[PDB]
Amino acid sequence: IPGANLLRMAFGVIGTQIVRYRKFEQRVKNDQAQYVSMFGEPFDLAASVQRVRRDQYAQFNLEFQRNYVMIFANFDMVDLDRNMAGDQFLWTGRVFQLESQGSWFYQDGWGVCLAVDIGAAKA
Amino acid sequence: MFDGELIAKLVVELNAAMTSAQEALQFPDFEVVQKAQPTQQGTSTRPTIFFQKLFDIPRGWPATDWHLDNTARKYVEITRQHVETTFQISSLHWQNPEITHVVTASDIANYVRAYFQARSTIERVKELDFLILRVSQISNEAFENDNHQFEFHPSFDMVVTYNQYIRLYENAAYSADGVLIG
């Protein structure tokens, strides 16, 4: 049934991991016509993280392997609109591009590994 | 002079140019690397310079001069060719929108081009047995980058002229005689 969420009751069997999730509120300018955004109050979320396991390429001598992650979470998260995306980090900052069945009960996600996190016990 | 000496000299000159440009524009740090690495490598997340060799132009008929070796009674033939080579210079830098102090990759490329076109640098590099012609264009190109973030890869090409030497052997004659008929 598309009523009670299946992911919530499935999380009682497989087992999950914990990530920190922060949402987007607004963006401003930096006298260069470049948007700079701000996020607010990161919180702890329970999600199942999967793999898609990238392969690299070349432009010229530049290998540029892009890092990807697949995440399942019972949250109504958005990747892109006339506004910004959301963020997360299992160990390094990440950002996703997809959508899922949010308005019924659950969603699943994506992720591209940005370089690192600030530190201080993984802020 | 061929390649190894030329590449080493160009690397030293590029290092000097970055050493100047760092105080000129206040970079965090820099690195100079060659494109087409023979071994698998990963790029560096710092202001970087890349160079590569495209092609060569013989530029003129070969010129031969003769040197005589008295002990072995042989001419050693020396042939000199004045070659032109084009090197492609490109840079890479990522823009952090939050910092207020702004420096662009195209800015670094422009400064590097300007350094090589100055009279003082040409005078200094003359003793290194090559010279530089004019540079006519710098172009910005945008690509998606591995982190799905738009980025610029400015580039331009540079021309250096030098001499190539080859050495060979030839016989020698020491006398002449003839016959006259009518």
Helix axes B4-25, B105-117, angle to 10 degrees: 120
The Cα–Cα gap between B89 and B71 comes to 49
Q: Within 13 Å and on the Cβ side, how many CA atoms surround B21?
A: 29
Beta bridge partners of A72: A48, A108
Structure tokens at B89: 């210079």
H runs (alpha helix) in B41-179? 105-117, 119-126
Beta bridge partners of B68: B75
From chain A, pick out residues whose CB is under 8 angstroms from the CB of B146. 64-67
B92 C-beta neighbours (distance < 10 Å), count = 24
Structure tokens at A107: 């969603």
Technique behind the model: cryo-EM
3-class DSSP assignment, residue B53: strand
Say yes or no for a CB contact (<8 Å) between A30 and B36: no
Q: Which of A36, A63, A66 sits opposite B42 (nearest CB)?
A: A63
Burial class (CB in 10 A: 0-12, 13-18, 19+), A5: middle
- Positive or negative, the CA dihedral B91, B102, B46, B112 is positive
CA distances (Å), B26 to each of A106, B77, B118, in order?
49, 53, 21
The Cα–Cα gap between B30 and A7 comes to 49
- Positive or negative, the CA dihedral B120, B125, B129, B130 is negative
3-class DSSP assignment, residue B152: strand
The total number of residues shown for chain B amounts to 182
The Cα–Cα gap between A70 and B60 comes to 61
Amino acid at B88: Q
CA distances (Å), A66 to each of A55, A57, B144, in order?
8, 9, 11
Q: Which of B40, B50, B146 sits opposite A64 (nearest CB)?
A: B146
B18 C-beta neighbours (distance < 10 Å), count = 22
The Cα–Cα gap between A26 and B176 comes to 97
Burial class (CB in 10 A: 0-12, 13-18, 19+), B137: exposed
Say yes or no for a CB contact (<8 Å) between B148 and A65: no
Structural contact between residues A32 and A98, judged by C-beta atoms closer than 8 angstroms? no
Structural contact between residues A76 and A102, judged by C-beta atoms closer than 8 angstroms? yes
Largest Cα span, chain B: 99
Q: Does B100 contact chain A (CB < 8 Å)?
A: yes
Label each residue of A6-24 as H, E or C: HHHHHCCCCCCEEEEEEEE
From chain A, pick out residues whose CB is under 8 angstroms from the CB of B103. none
Task: Give the DSSP H or E segment for B72.
Answer: none
CA dihedral of A54, A55, A60, A62, whole degrees rounded to 10? 50
Q: Which of A41, A24, A6, A21 is nearest to A111 (CA)?
A: A21
Structural contact between residues B167 and B76, judged by C-beta atoms closer than 8 angstroms? yes
Amino acid at A83: N
Beta bridge partners of B31: B48
Task: Give the DSSP H or E segment for A106.
Answer: none
Helix axes B119-126, B105-117, angle to 10 degrees: 60
CA dihedral of B139, B140, B144, B150, whole degrees rounded to 10? 180
A113 C-beta neighbours (distance < 10 Å), count = 19
Q: Does A54 contact chain B (CB < 8 Å)?
A: no
Beta bridge partners of A95: A112
Q: Does A28 contact chain B (CB < 8 Å)?
A: no
The resolution, in angstroms to one decimal, equals: 3.1
Q: Does A103 contact chain B (CB < 8 Å)?
A: no
What chain A residue is nearest to B153 in terms of C-alpha separation? Answer: A59
Beta bridge partners of B90: B50, B155
